[PDB]
Copies of this chain bind each other. A is one copy, B any other.
Amino acid sequence: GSLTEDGLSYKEKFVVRSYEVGSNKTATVETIANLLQEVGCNHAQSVGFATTTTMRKLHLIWVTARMHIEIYKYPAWGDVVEIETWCQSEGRIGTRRDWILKDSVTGEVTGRATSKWVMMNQDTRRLQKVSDDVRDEYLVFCPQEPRLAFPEENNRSLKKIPKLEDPAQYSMIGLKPRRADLDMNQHVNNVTYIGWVLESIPQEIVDTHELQVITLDYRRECQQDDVVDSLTTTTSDSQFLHLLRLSGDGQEINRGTTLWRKK
């Protein structure tokens, strides 16, 4: 991995591994989600971070609010995938990290992703608008002209996800995170939520369709000792509405939509 010539984005090549591919011999969306996280961490480290000097002193962290992924073609085991990432400012709302997935040989675009991040106090789990003195430290690493992975005026990533009404058509109950589902700071990482959402997709859809789009709205963080229920309903290409909630009280932690295409 390395910073581009202008230092305003990062490129990294990954060779797809045997344990990273699924039932159809191509990479899983959870492996892709890990590769986006990895390329994002190396971009943050190549610029000197992923928090800034002042936001470290204030006990401030960046948390994901939304994730949108679109895959046209999944790389096969042994294929080389080049990913390009970059940050941008969204005024006082937060930051946006974008990604482009390309084929190393053909040079074609095989996928793209976008995510919205919000700023919160590490301890009180509050939420606050981006302060100006914080923006001045990280804006020198973002391109000044807007660079959108999903440019198109009203595309797919910025649509409001509704709440799944009961009874759900499909469900997967009693989901618990293991120690491998936790990050270096013992927090359940945002890739596990994608896996948990897909656990309630019927096996017949898995065997006849391929995942093309996935939008996830993060509402609350799941804890190490928490139990989650995964709910899904066909809203239609096959489309679904998903809901992750705490097994007991039914407190919402995530809501999303997936779109599948016929193989």
Contacts and interface: CB of A to CB of B under 8 A. Distances in A.
Interface string A182-219: 11101001010001101100000010000000000000
Given A19-B38, A38-B19, A186-B23, A178 B199 contact: yes
Nearest to A201: B179
Interface range on chain A: under 10, 10 to 19, 20 to 34, or 35 or more? 20 to 34
A25 B183 CA distance: 10
A28 B180 contact: yes
Nearest to A174: B174
Chain multiplicity (copies): 2
Nearest to A196: B178
A262 interface: no
A178 to B, nearest CB: 6
Nearest to A25: B184
Q: Lowest 6 CB-CB distances: which A-B pairs, in order?
A: A18-B41, A19-B34, A17-B38, A30-B180, A180-B195, A18-B38
